[PDB]
């Protein structure tokens, strides 16, 4: 009896859903009367499904309706935890213990990767006489990020970056510049600790 | 790391799951694991100790720094003994102090078990 796992680490976007699998051997038809399937995170019970019955009374309230075992797929020796709207507490080491004739357990790691992927952008004509414009970029993700402004010359411009927040960071950057029409500037969000450089273009 | 429910059946479920899983971590013989469950707790047996430690921490009776937690033992023993015998368990087993954490785990299992063995769940 040997429980296995396709991926040992899941890297999943904040808010996007998640399914982490745990396989186990099923030679004949599955006998739900003798199956036990237990998912736990850290200091947290996620699934306790034993003898056909998913025990809803032990599941942590912070999973109490976001998570569920894909019961259809157990008949395929596949114990799948699914988790809707992956938040920031959902990151960490999970464990899946299965018991069906034998017993095994495996651990899975889940990072909730929040790259600053949805960059918002605004350009404001502060002053039509002096052509003073205000170019903004606003994105959100878990490792804090700096913002680098560059004109089309790829010279580095100086902008104002304000970082705020539970564990996800919101980074708004603004660049006041005297610029003409059709000129291109570039807001890059260096996600620092994980190098996930993303450059949005403002025209 | 684990769960605490409030109906004999949920508890019996959590009992059988945590027992199996702690056998999986420790390596403890099935017979020694039963003796632990049955009350027969070799305090100085290292496999016994590790299983006590795993299983008490799964039911959150010992926390991550080996501190006895009254809440978790209430949640488990409310289902085998009366309220006042629960109070007396808390206060008696609070004096157990060991710098050897596994030795501490085996001794708490001792101290708890003397109020009712955990195999009593199989009897509900
Ligand atoms: N000249 C500049 N680019 N100034 C940037 C100011 C950033 C601001 N103090 C912040 O860290 O929240």
From TrEMBL, chain A:
Sequence ranges assigned to domain Ig-like in this UniProt record: 15-109, 115-203
Q: What is this protein called?
A: Programmed cell death 1 ligand 1
One GO MF term on file is:
transcription coactivator activity
Where is this protein localized, as stated in its record?
A: Cell membrane; Early endosome membrane; Recycling endosome membrane
Q: Name one GO cellular component term.
A: early endosome membrane
Taxonomy of origin reads: Eukaryota, Metazoa, Chordata, Craniata, Vertebrata
Q: Quote the function comment for this protein.
A: The PDCD1-mediated inhibitory pathway is exploited by tumors to attenuate anti-tumor immunity and escape destruction by the immune system, thereby facilitating tumor survival. The interaction with PDCD1/PD-1 inhibits cytotoxic T lymphocytes (CTLs) effector function. The blockage of the PDCD1-mediated pathway results in the reversal of the exhausted T-cell phenotype and the normalization of the anti-tumor response, providing a rationale for cancer immunotherapy.
Decide whether keyword Cell membrane is in the record. yes
Keyword Ubl conjugation attached: yes
Q: Which family does it belong to?
A: Belongs to the immunoglobulin superfamily. BTN/MOG family.
Keywords per UniProt: Adaptive immunity, Cell membrane, Disulfide bond, Endosome, Glycoprotein, Immunity, Immunoglobulin domain, Membrane, Receptor, Repeat, Signal, Transmembrane, Transmembrane helix, Ubl conjugation
Note the residue range shown relative to the complete protein: 19 to 225 of 303
GO BP terms in the entry = adaptive immune response; cell surface receptor signaling pathway; negative regulation of activated T cell proliferation; negative regulation of CD4-positive, alpha-beta T cell proliferation; negative regulation of CD8-positive, alpha-beta T cell activation; negative regulation of interleukin-10 production; negative regulation of T cell mediated immune response to tumor cell; negative regulation of tumor necrosis factor superfamily cytokine production
């Amino acid at each position: 009896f040997t429980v296995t796992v396709p991926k040992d680490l899941y890297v999943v976007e904040y808010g996007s859903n998640m399914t982490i699998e745990c396989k186990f051997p099923v030679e004949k038809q599955l006998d739900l009367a003798a199956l036990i399937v237990y998912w736990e995170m850290e200091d947290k019970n996620i699934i306790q499904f034993v003898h056909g019955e998913e025990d809803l009374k032990v599941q942590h309230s912070s999973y109490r309706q976001r998570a569920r075992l894909l019961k259809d797929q157990l008949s395929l020796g596949n114990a799948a935890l699914q988790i809707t709207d992956v938040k920031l507490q959902d990151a960490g080491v999970y464990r899946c213990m299965i018991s069906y004739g034998g017993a095994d357990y495996k651990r899975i790691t889940v990072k909730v990767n929040a790259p600053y992927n949805k960059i918002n952008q605004r350009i404001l004509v502060v002053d039509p006489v002096t052509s003073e414009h205000e170019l903004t970029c606003q994105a959100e993700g878990y490792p804090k990020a700096e913002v680098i402004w560059t004109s089309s010359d790829h010279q580095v411009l100086s902008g104002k970056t304000t970082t705020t927040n539970e564990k996800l960071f919101n980074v708004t950057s603004t660049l006041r510049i005297n610029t003409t029409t059709n000129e291109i500037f570039y807001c890059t969000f260096r996600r620092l600790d994980p190098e996930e450089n993303h450059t949005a273009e403002l025209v | 790391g684990g769960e605490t429910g409030s109906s004999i059946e949920s508890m019996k479920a959590s009992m059988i799951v945590q027992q199996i899983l702690c056998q999986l971590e420790t390596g403890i013989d099935q017979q020694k694991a039963n003796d632990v469950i049955e009350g027969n707790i070799d305090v100085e047996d290292k496999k016994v100790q590790l299983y006590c430690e795993c299983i008490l921490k799964q039911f959150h009776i010992l926390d991550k720094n080996n501190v006895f937690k009254p809440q978790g033992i209430k949640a488990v023993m409310e289902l085998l003994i009366d309220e006042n015998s629960v109070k007396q368990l808390v206060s008696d087993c609070s004096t157990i102090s060991e710098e050897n954490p596994h030795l501490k785990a085996s001794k708490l299992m001792q101290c708890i078990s003397k109020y009712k063995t955990w195999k009593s769940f199989d009897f509900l």
